[PDB]
Each structure stands twice: as C-alpha cells, then as structure tokens.
Design a protein around this motif. Structure first.
Motif, PDB file in Angstrom:
ATOM      1  N   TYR A   1       9.266  -9.342  12.002  1.00 42.85           N
ATOM      2  CA  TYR A   1       9.797  -9.303  13.398  1.00 42.85           C
ATOM      3  C   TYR A   1       9.752  -7.852  13.925  1.00 42.85           C
ATOM      4  CZ  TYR A   1      11.536 -13.800  11.761  1.00 42.85           C
ATOM      5  OH  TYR A   1      11.636 -15.072  11.235  1.00 42.85           O
ATOM      6  N   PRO A   2       8.559  -7.354  14.215  1.00 42.57           N
ATOM      7  CA  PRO A   2       8.387  -5.974  14.711  1.00 42.57           C
ATOM      8  C   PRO A   2       8.656  -5.870  16.221  1.00 42.57           C
ATOM      9  CG  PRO A   2       6.194  -7.037  14.322  1.00 42.57           C
ATOM     10  CD  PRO A   2       7.281  -8.097  14.072  1.00 42.57           C
ATOM     11  N   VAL A   3       8.691  -6.974  16.929  1.00 47.91           N
ATOM     12  CA  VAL A   3       8.929  -6.909  18.405  1.00 47.91           C
ATOM     13  C   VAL A   3      10.427  -6.970  18.701  1.00 47.91           C
ATOM     14  CG1 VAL A   3       8.309  -7.890  20.608  1.00 47.91           C
ATOM     15  CG2 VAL A   3       6.782  -8.171  18.649  1.00 47.91           C
ATOM     16  N   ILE A   4      11.001  -5.892  19.172  1.00 51.66           N
ATOM     17  CA  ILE A   4      12.459  -5.912  19.491  1.00 51.66           C
ATOM     18  C   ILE A   4      12.637  -6.321  20.964  1.00 51.66           C
ATOM     19  CG2 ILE A   4      13.311  -3.653  20.406  1.00 51.66           C
ATOM     20  CD1 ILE A   4      14.192  -5.052  16.981  1.00 51.66           C
ATOM     21  N   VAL A   5      13.291  -7.429  21.200  1.00 52.56           N
ATOM     22  CA  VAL A   5      13.495  -7.899  22.599  1.00 52.56           C
ATOM     23  C   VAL A   5      14.849  -7.399  23.113  1.00 52.56           C
ATOM     24  CG1 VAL A   5      13.567  -9.926  24.070  1.00 52.56           C
ATOM     25  CG2 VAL A   5      12.133  -9.913  22.028  1.00 52.56           C
ATOM     26  N   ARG A   6      15.038  -7.423  24.406  1.00 50.53           N
ATOM     27  CA  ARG A   6      16.321  -6.952  25.002  1.00 50.53           C
ATOM     28  C   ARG A   6      17.143  -8.163  25.449  1.00 50.53           C
ATOM     29  NH1 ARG A   6      17.002  -1.586  27.239  1.00 50.53           N
ATOM     30  NH2 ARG A   6      18.456  -1.501  28.967  1.00 50.53           N
ATOM     31  N   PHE A   7      18.444  -8.029  25.477  1.00 51.53           N
ATOM     32  CA  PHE A   7      19.310  -9.167  25.904  1.00 51.53           C
ATOM     33  C   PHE A   7      20.570  -8.627  26.580  1.00 51.53           C
ATOM     34  CE2 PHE A   7      16.849 -12.294  23.693  1.00 51.53           C
ATOM     35  CZ  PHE A   7      16.211 -11.533  22.708  1.00 51.53           C
ATOM     36  N   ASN A   8      20.837  -9.053  27.790  1.00 49.31           N
ATOM     37  CA  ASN A   8      22.061  -8.579  28.502  1.00 49.31           C
ATOM     38  C   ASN A   8      23.303  -9.013  27.715  1.00 49.31           C
ATOM     39  OD1 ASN A   8      21.340  -7.120  30.818  1.00 49.31           O
ATOM     40  ND2 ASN A   8      20.503  -8.915  31.736  1.00 49.31           N
ATOM     41  N   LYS A   9      23.193 -10.077  26.957  1.00 47.15           N
ATOM     42  CA  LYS A   9      24.351 -10.565  26.153  1.00 47.15           C
ATOM     43  C   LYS A   9      24.781  -9.481  25.160  1.00 47.15           C
ATOM     44  CE  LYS A   9      27.088 -12.398  26.638  1.00 47.15           C
ATOM     45  NZ  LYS A   9      28.132 -13.331  27.149  1.00 47.15           N
ATOM     46  N   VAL A  10      25.988  -9.565  24.666  1.00 47.97           N
ATOM     47  CA  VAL A  10      26.478  -8.549  23.690  1.00 47.97           C
ATOM     48  C   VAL A  10      27.311  -9.248  22.613  1.00 47.97           C
ATOM     49  CG1 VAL A  10      27.727  -6.398  23.450  1.00 47.97           C
ATOM     50  CG2 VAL A  10      26.553  -6.930  25.588  1.00 47.97           C
ATOM     51  N   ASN A  11      27.536  -8.594  21.502  1.00 52.87           N
ATOM     52  CA  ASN A  11      28.340  -9.222  20.411  1.00 52.87           C
ATOM     53  C   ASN A  11      29.528  -8.322  20.064  1.00 52.87           C
ATOM     54  OD1 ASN A  11      29.065  -9.854  17.458  1.00 52.87           O
ATOM     55  ND2 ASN A  11      27.842 -11.558  18.063  1.00 52.87           N
ATOM     56  N   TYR A  12      30.690  -8.903  19.894  1.00 50.00           N
ATOM     57  CA  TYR A  12      31.897  -8.095  19.553  1.00 50.00           C
ATOM     58  C   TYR A  12      32.922  -8.981  18.840  1.00 50.00           C
ATOM     59  CZ  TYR A  12      30.237  -4.130  22.178  1.00 50.00           C
ATOM     60  OH  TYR A  12      29.508  -3.041  22.608  1.00 50.00           O
ATOM     61  N   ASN A  13      32.465  -9.996  18.147  1.00 48.31           N
ATOM     62  CA  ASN A  13      33.407 -10.903  17.428  1.00 48.31           C
ATOM     63  C   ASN A  13      33.157 -10.814  15.921  1.00 48.31           C
ATOM     64  OD1 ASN A  13      31.303 -13.295  16.780  1.00 48.31           O
ATOM     65  ND2 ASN A  13      30.875 -12.383  18.716  1.00 48.31           N
ATOM     66  N   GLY A  14      33.931 -10.017  15.229  1.00 54.71           N
ATOM     67  CA  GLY A  14      33.748  -9.879  13.754  1.00 54.71           C
ATOM     68  C   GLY A  14      32.364  -9.298  13.461  1.00 54.71           C
ATOM     69  N   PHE A  15      32.205  -8.009  13.628  1.00 54.50           N
ATOM     70  CA  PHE A  15      30.883  -7.371  13.360  1.00 54.50           C
ATOM     71  C   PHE A  15      31.037  -6.315  12.263  1.00 54.50           C
ATOM     72  CE2 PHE A  15      32.396  -3.550  15.292  1.00 54.50           C
ATOM     73  CZ  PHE A  15      33.361  -4.021  16.190  1.00 54.50           C
ATOM     74  N   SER A  16      31.935  -6.540  11.334  1.00 52.21           N
ATOM     75  CA  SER A  16      32.147  -5.556  10.227  1.00 52.21           C
ATOM     76  C   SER A  16      32.570  -4.206  10.811  1.00 52.21           C
ATOM     77  CB  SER A  16      30.849  -5.385   9.434  1.00 52.21           C
ATOM     78  OG  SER A  16      31.161  -5.160   8.066  1.00 52.21           O
ATOM     79  N   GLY A  17      32.552  -3.171  10.009  1.00 53.19           N
ATOM     80  CA  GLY A  17      32.952  -1.823  10.508  1.00 53.19           C
ATOM     81  C   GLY A  17      31.709  -0.945  10.662  1.00 53.19           C
ATOM     82  N   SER A  18      30.777  -1.362  11.482  1.00 54.87           N
ATOM     83  CA  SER A  18      29.536  -0.558  11.684  1.00 54.87           C
ATOM     84  C   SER A  18      28.951  -0.865  13.065  1.00 54.87           C
ATOM     85  CB  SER A  18      28.513  -0.920  10.606  1.00 54.87           C
ATOM     86  OG  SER A  18      27.444   0.017  10.641  1.00 54.87           O
ATOM     87  N   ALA A  19      29.143   0.022  14.011  1.00 55.24           N
ATOM     88  CA  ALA A  19      28.604  -0.203  15.387  1.00 55.24           C
ATOM     89  C   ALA A  19      29.202  -1.486  15.971  1.00 55.24           C
ATOM     90  CB  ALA A  19      27.079  -0.330  15.329  1.00 55.24           C
ATOM     91  N   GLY A  20      28.757  -1.881  17.137  1.00 56.72           N
ATOM     92  CA  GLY A  20      29.294  -3.123  17.768  1.00 56.72           C
ATOM     93  C   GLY A  20      28.263  -3.687  18.748  1.00 56.72           C
ATOM     94  N   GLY A  21      28.102  -4.985  18.770  1.00 54.44           N
ATOM     95  CA  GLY A  21      27.115  -5.608  19.700  1.00 54.44           C
ATOM     96  C   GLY A  21      25.698  -5.209  19.285  1.00 54.44           C
ATOM     97  N   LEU A  22      24.773  -6.134  19.337  1.00 52.82           N
ATOM     98  CA  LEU A  22      23.367  -5.818  18.946  1.00 52.82           C
ATOM     99  C   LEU A  22      22.602  -5.324  20.172  1.00 52.82           C
ATOM    100  CD1 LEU A  22      22.785  -6.189  16.054  1.00 52.82           C
ATOM    101  CD2 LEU A  22      24.638  -7.620  16.933  1.00 52.82           C
ATOM    102  N   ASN A  23      22.493  -6.163  21.183  1.00 54.13           N
ATOM    103  CA  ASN A  23      21.754  -5.812  22.452  1.00 54.13           C
ATOM    104  C   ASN A  23      20.248  -6.071  22.285  1.00 54.13           C
ATOM    105  OD1 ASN A  23      24.328  -4.824  22.883  1.00 54.13           O
ATOM    106  ND2 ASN A  23      23.797  -2.768  22.379  1.00 54.13           N
ATOM    107  N   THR A  24      19.682  -5.761  21.140  1.00 53.03           N
ATOM    108  CA  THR A  24      18.224  -6.004  20.930  1.00 53.03           C
ATOM    109  C   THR A  24      18.030  -6.806  19.643  1.00 53.03           C
ATOM    110  OG1 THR A  24      17.914  -3.992  19.639  1.00 53.03           O
ATOM    111  CG2 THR A  24      17.797  -3.804  22.040  1.00 53.03           C
ATOM    112  N   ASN A  25      17.279  -7.874  19.708  1.00 61.81           N
ATOM    113  CA  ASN A  25      17.048  -8.708  18.491  1.00 61.81           C
ATOM    114  C   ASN A  25      15.628  -8.469  17.974  1.00 61.81           C
ATOM    115  OD1 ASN A  25      19.538  -9.852  18.359  1.00 61.81           O
ATOM    116  ND2 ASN A  25      18.843 -11.916  18.215  1.00 61.81           N
ATOM    117  N   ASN A  26      15.296  -9.045  16.847  1.00 56.09           N
ATOM    118  CA  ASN A  26      13.926  -8.864  16.284  1.00 56.09           C
ATOM    119  C   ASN A  26      13.182 -10.199  16.352  1.00 56.09           C
ATOM    120  OD1 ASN A  26      14.007  -6.053  14.431  1.00 56.09           O
ATOM    121  ND2 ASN A  26      15.922  -6.875  15.079  1.00 56.09           N
ATOM    122  N   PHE A  27      11.917 -10.172  16.687  1.00 53.84           N
ATOM    123  CA  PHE A  27      11.132 -11.436  16.776  1.00 53.84           C
ATOM    124  C   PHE A  27       9.649 -11.133  16.556  1.00 53.84           C
ATOM    125  CE2 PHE A  27      14.915 -12.395  19.379  1.00 53.84           C
ATOM    126  CZ  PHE A  27      15.396 -13.413  18.547  1.00 53.84           C
TER     127      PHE A  27
END
Length: 69
Positions: A34-60
């Motif tokens: 999955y070398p193509v990183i796509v963008r997404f207005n959606k965000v993540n903030y529900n139980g994401f461990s203790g490292s950064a928050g929300g992805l914003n870009t996924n791999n495909f």
C-alpha cells in the motif's frame, strides 16, 4: 491512473473509510503493498494508544483505489 490530488474511491473491505473517497496525496515508489497514501477529512480519536492521534491519511495499493475523478 491514480493522479495526484484526484478523487479515489477506497475499495478496502476492512477499512474505516471503505466506500468513501479520499484525496490522493502522493504515491510511494518503495514496493510495499500500500504505497499510495490517500487523504481523508475524517479523523480518529477513540482509543489510539499513547502515540499521536487521528490518522488523516490511509494506505492503499493502486488496484485497491478506484480513481473516478
């Protein structure tokens, strides 16, 4: 094709943005699956461990994205 900044419909079954469309940010010429990183207005903030928050870009992969424009 998969252009830069084009609208690509994510076709990943198990994915938080499956069925939606993300804005292509850039491709990766490394060789992974999955070398193509796509963008997404959606965000993540529900139980994401203790490292950064929300992805914003996924791999495909190229065949995993459906560039419709």
């Amino acid at each position: 094709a998969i252009e830069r900044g084009s609208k690509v419909k994510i076709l990943r079954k198990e994915s938080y943005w499956y069925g939606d469309v993300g804005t292509v940010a850039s491709i990766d010429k490394s060789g992974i699956i999955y070398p193509v990183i796509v963008r997404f207005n959606k965000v993540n903030y529900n139980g994401f461990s203790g490292s950064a928050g929300g992805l914003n870009t996924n791999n495909f992969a190229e065949h995993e994205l459906e560039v419709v424009g």
